[PDB]
Amino acid sequence: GHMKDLKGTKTAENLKQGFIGESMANRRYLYFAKRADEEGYPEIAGLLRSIAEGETAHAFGHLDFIRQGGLTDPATDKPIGTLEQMIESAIAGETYEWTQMYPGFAKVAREEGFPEVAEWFETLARAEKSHAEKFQNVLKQLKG
Amino acid sequence: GHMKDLKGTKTAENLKQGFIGESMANRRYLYFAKRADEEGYPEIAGLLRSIAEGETAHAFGHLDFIRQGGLTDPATDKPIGTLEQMIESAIAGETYEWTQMYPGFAKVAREEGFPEVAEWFETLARAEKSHAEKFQNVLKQLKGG
Numbered sequence: 001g002h003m004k005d006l007k008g009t010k011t012a013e014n015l016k017q018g019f020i021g022e023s024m025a026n027r028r029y030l031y032f033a034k035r036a037d038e039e040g041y042p043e044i045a046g047l048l049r050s051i052a053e054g055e056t057a058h059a060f061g062h063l064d065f066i067r068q069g070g071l072t073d074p075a076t077d078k079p080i081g082t083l084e085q086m087i088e089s090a091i092a093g094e095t096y097e098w099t100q101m102y103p104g105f106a107k108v109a110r111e112e113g114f115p116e117v118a119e120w121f122e123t124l125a126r127a128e129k130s131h132a133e134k135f136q137n138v139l140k141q142l143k144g
Numbered sequence: 145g146h147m148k149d150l151k152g153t154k155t156a157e158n159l160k161q162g163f164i165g166e167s168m169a170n171r172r173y174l175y176f177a178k179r180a181d182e183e184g185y186p187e188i189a190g191l192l193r194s195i196a197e198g199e200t201a202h203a204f205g206h207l208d209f210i211r212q213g214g215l216t217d218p219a220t221d222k223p224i225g226t227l228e229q230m231i232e233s234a235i236a237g238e239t240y241e242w243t244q245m246y247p248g249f250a251k252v253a254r255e256e257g258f259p260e261v262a263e264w265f266e267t268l269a270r271a272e273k274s275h276a277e278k279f280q281n282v283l284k285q286l287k288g289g
């Protein structure tokens with residue numbers, strides 16, 4: 001892209017790890033905010049939500065440098081330069097999750113005697129299959 | 145098995161990995177939505193944003209099973225049962241990021257000849273220090289009444 005090539009560098013890997021941590025931080029802080037909401041701590045909840053916006057900005061800035069430096073999506077190792085490529089990355093990740101990840105998690109949960117957790121992973125596998133199908137119909141739109 | 149004691153199981157690890165992936169998917173899809181927004185694809189942007197809500201539900205469900213199973217926060221390996229423990233997990237992560245992770249990333253980026261990336265990591269280091277201090281303030285309010 002726009003900037004000096006980051007391929008082959010330690011910085012490339014650090015941007016990926018930064019993106020993973022920032023992604024988790026936003027989810028964690030919003031989950032924590034719900035506990036503060038329940039308990040009656042609206043100032044704590046509001047701080048968590050505002051900090052979570054900071055973690056969004058951080059995550060998106062990591063993706064900017066990744067894209068501009070000619071690197072691939074942290075989650076899928078697919079390019080994310082153009083909107084079509086971004087939809088193709090969404091399709092790849094959803095496909096991995098419904099064909100491999102969540103069915104395997106469900107099988108292991110049933111073997112280890114956690115049927116309720118297995119049912120959740122089976123719900124998710126069907127959900128990611130649905131996601132994949134909806135993104136595939138977008139891609140068809142774009143290429144036409 | 146006992147779903148309230150998942151420690152040491154493969155299912156414990158799979159909940160953690162599922163959380164990581166779902167967290168990334170929400171961020172990715174909201175970032176992709178902005179590209180659809182500027183190009184004039186409001187239905188694609190809307191789909192991305194709606195699917196992103198799905199990925200929020202998935203991530204939060206994984207955290208529910210993690211906390212009910214006595215497992216720790218995927219990001220910090222700290223318990224997250226109570227609100228106080230959640231704030232302590234936030235402090236632990238922010239402290240790692242500003243004292244070690246982002247300064248180290250900045251040094252590597254400067255040494256590799258990427259000064260704009262280095263400056264970004266130094267901005268983030270100072271940001272996570274500020275976060276840590278704000279969360280410390282909350283803990284003082286919680287711990288001391």
Ligand SMILES: [Cl-]
Pocket residue numbers: 040041042043044045
């Ligand atoms: Cl409050």
Ligand SMILES: [Cl-]
Pocket residue numbers: 184185186187188189
């Ligand atoms: Cl559209």
Ligand SMILES: [Fe+3]
Pocket residue numbers: 022025054055058268272
């Ligand atoms: Fe951050």
Ligand SMILES: [Fe+3]
Pocket residue numbers: 094127128131169195198199
């Ligand atoms: Fe999905």
Ligand SMILES: [Fe+3]
Pocket residue numbers: 124128166169198199202
């Ligand atoms: Fe999902």
Ligand SMILES: [Fe+3]
Pocket residue numbers: 025051054055238271272275
């Ligand atoms: Fe932070």
